[PDB]
């Protein structure tokens, strides 16, 4: 017993680019998921295992707080069976995924007049990610054949783009902080519970 440090994930001052997404292992703590689902401040809150009522009543060996920023029209893609720039090249969930996506509009925090260049995403990739792969490679994307020779140019894409979040974009093109809770049962009996 003390209190799981969800505080550190949700109220984080800075948040990760989606290519370079953060994971935070949660172990050896109480929980209290209801602080989460009862916030006001969550625009999105799909669960995919479990009614978030009865996940307060249940115990897991580990919990992971995957946490990045995307644009609002991308938050469609943070789910099972999804497809596009974000699901394919930046953050895939599995088809059998059982946990919770939370997100919320962060236009106040993560925008600037001229653009916030800090957030980025990956535009091209020789194939799609496996579930929960991350790729923080640079490496010039070869869209043609005829090779790149480390020039960026025609058919030769530097494959990480900036979002450039202004506060005068429309809601589809403004930044959303996302947080995926993933829940695994294993051998070594329990670590994270519910009071």
């Amino acid at each position: 017993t003390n209190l799981c440090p969800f505080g550190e994930v949700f109220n984080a001052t800075r948040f990760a680019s989606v290519y370079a997404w953060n994971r935070k292992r949660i172990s050896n703590c109480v929980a209290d998921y209801s602080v989460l689902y009862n916030s006001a401040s969550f625009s999105t809150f799909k669960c995919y295992g479990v009614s978030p009522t009865k996940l307060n009543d249940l115990c897991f060996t580990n919990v992971y707080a995957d946490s990045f920023v995307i644009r609002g029209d991308e938050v469609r893609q943070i789910a099972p069976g999804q497809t596009g720039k974000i699901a394919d090249y930046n953050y895939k969930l599995p088809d059998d995924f059982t946990g919770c996506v939370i997100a919320w509009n962060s236009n106040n925090l993560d925008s600037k007049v001229g653009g916030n260049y800090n957030y980025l995403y990956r535009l091209f990739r020789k194939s799609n990610l496996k579930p929960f792969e991350r790729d923080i490679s640079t490496e010039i994307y070869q869209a043609g054949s005829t090779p790149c020779n480390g020039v960026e140019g025609f058919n030769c894409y530097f494959p990480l783009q900036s979002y450039g979040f202004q506060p005068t974009n429309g809601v589809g093109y403004q930044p959303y902080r996302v947080v995926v809770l993933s829940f695994e049962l294993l051998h070594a009996p329990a670590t994270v519970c519910g009071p």
């Epitope: 680019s17 290519y19 370079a20 953060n22 994971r23 480390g150």
Partner: nanobody, 120 residues
Amino acid sequence: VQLVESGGGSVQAGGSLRLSCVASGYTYCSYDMSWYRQAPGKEREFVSIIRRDGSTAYTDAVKGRFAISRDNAKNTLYLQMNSLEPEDTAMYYCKSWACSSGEYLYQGDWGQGTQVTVSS
């Protein structure tokens, strides 16, 4: 980690300039590094990268006029700009890319930028 650009200024076209970016502060791994530029009113375009394995890429506009170099001894990143045209006028920005070590992950950083300004 706190990047800080320097060098650059007003320069007659066909001259040269050395940009210096100086890292300050630690991190639990070693990261790639880029030059970006943002022209007047155009957005931020990539200029070059250099990676852990010592590979470079350059943007086709600057390929063979411009050269990226690190001195890890002094934690300093170098852009040699030669035979500057007016098109090369821009605010120039150094960027540190990501890396992991273990559970931890480093995001990156941009600097304030410095103004290059190329007449004729």
